[PDB]
């Protein structure tokens, strides 16, 4: 009877940090994947199943749209088969991915003068994440041989570091909001 509400995830006031990505399941709807593709207000739009046209020529069981914000310079890791500090420790899409990655600069909103530290990213983990995992722990990372007894200090590092977005940064280090739609009926096009 009505549009899938992308206006809820893409045009939303605040975006979640990558370590703690937000995910919206979408159902009992169907929307055009060709206002997004023909938007032209997005710097990235790459699909891994089939092309953005036939997609709205098909119906799926359920569609999910995860959303977070990273450095533009790391968007190349939101894809199957990649490795980095974001695809291993914060967010990892499977090598059998079917869906589309979409991303645009957010430097007007997510960056601040004097730095915006609301955006965190995990920087230490003892092994990478399995596909679509979400780790929100904050336990002190022990990087030595001696335990930390719960005190941040040498070799005892609190695991989340903050993107220090400032508006005067370089574009490869400026805020990119990202939305990843994955596909597995209730919605179609």
């Amino acid at each position: 009877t009505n549009l899938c509400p992308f206006g809820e995830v893409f045009n939303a006031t605040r975006f979640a940090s990558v370590y703690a990505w937000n995910r919206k399941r979408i159902s009992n709807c169907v929307a055009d994947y060709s206002v997004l593709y023909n938007s032209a207000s997005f710097s990235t739009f790459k699909c891994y199943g089939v092309s953005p046209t036939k997609l709205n020529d098909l119906c799926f069981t359920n569609v999910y749209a995860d959303s977070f914000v990273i450095r533009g310079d790391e968007v190349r890791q939101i894809a199957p088969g990649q490795t980095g500090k974001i695809a291993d420790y914060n967010y990892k899409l499977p090598d059998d991915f079917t869906g589309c990655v979409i991303a645009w600069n957010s430097n007007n909103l997510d960056s601040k003068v004097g730095g915006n530290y609301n955006y965190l990213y995990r920087l230490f983990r003892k092994s990478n994440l399995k596909p679509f995992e979400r780790d929100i722990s904050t336990e002190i990372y022990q990087a030595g041989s001696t335990p930390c007894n719960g005190v941040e200090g040498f070799n005892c590092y609190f695991p989340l570091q903050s993107y220090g977005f400032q508006p005067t940064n370089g574009v490869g280090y400026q805020p990119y909001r990202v939305v990843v739609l994955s596909f597995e009926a209730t919605v179609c096009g």
Partner: antibody
Framework: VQLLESGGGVVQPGGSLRLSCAAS????????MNWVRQAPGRGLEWVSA????????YYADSVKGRFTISRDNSKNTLYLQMNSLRAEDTAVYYC??????????????????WGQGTLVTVSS | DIVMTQSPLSLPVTPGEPASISCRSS???????????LDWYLQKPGQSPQLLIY???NRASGVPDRFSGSGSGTDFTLKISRVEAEDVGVYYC?????????FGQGTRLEIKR
């Protein structure tokens, strides 16, 4: 790193004022912060401490009920509203950021960077 | 309320000499994991305080290699190896173990010249 503090001035004995402290140059959403105050020429007295996403607050028996501390990590700013203000509550108020973010790094523990301070005076 | 008392409350030194402020508590502050939860703050004139030592003997970020604090359990001691004019202020100790944070009355270093 900067903990900048706003609010402060004179309110009538029996009245109500709310101090805000706005931080920048650090995570904030991960660090628990406290409010310490000291009366003119008297030494430092502890007031309250709040954990990293609200949900945990401790206060001095001398202030239970009158003031409530809270914060908005979306706006990176910590507040402390005190009511039923009396003779003994006039002192400089400082927000401090606690040092550790681990546990056993208690939320009312060692303060790492303190604010410039804003003075509150309570008299007719 | 753990009660803390330091001494002396007036310590007069001469640049280049050592100074040493001691601060002892009512209840022991040993271990909530193996560390002594008692720190040392300095408050210069017209300034808000600043951490010097934390968890007993751990120098804070930025604080000079000349400041150090020792002791364990109930007996603590902060010592400035070589005092400098720039170090005159008031020094308070505080326990960070139990819920009411409590500090000392302060020790006013006066510099002799």
């Amino acid at each position: 790193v900067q903990l900048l503090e706003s609010g402060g001035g004179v309110v009538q004995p029996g009245g109500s004022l709310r101090l805000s402290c706005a931080a920048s140059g650090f995570a904030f959403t991960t660090y628990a912060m406290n409010w310490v105050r000291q009366a003119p020429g008297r030494g430092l007295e502890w007031v309250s401490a709040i954990s990293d996403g609200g949900g945990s607050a401790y206060y001095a028996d001398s202030v239970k009920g009158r003031f409530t501390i809270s914060r908005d990590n979306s706006k990176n700013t910590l507040y402390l509203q005190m009511n039923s203000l009396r003779a003994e509550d006039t002192a400089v108020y400082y927000c401090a950021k606690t040092r550790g973010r681990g546990l056993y790094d208690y939320v009312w523990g060692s303060k790492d960077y303190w604010g410039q301070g804003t003075l509150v005076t309570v008299s007719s | 309320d753990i009660v803390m008392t330091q001494s002396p409350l007036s310590l007069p030194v001469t640049p280049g000499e050592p100074a040493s402020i001691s601060c002892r508590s009512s209840q022991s502050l040993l271990h909530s994991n193996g560390y002594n939860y008692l720190d040392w703050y300095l408050q210069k004139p017209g300034q808000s305080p600043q951490l010097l030592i934390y968890l007993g003997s751990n120098r804070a970020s930025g604080v000079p290699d000349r400041f150090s604090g020792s002791g364990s359990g109930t007996d603590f001691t902060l010592k400035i190896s070589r005092v400098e004019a720039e170090d005159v202020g008031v020094y308070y100790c505080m326990q960070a173990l139990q819920t009411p944070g409590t500090f000392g009355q302060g020790t006013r270093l006066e510099i002799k010249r």
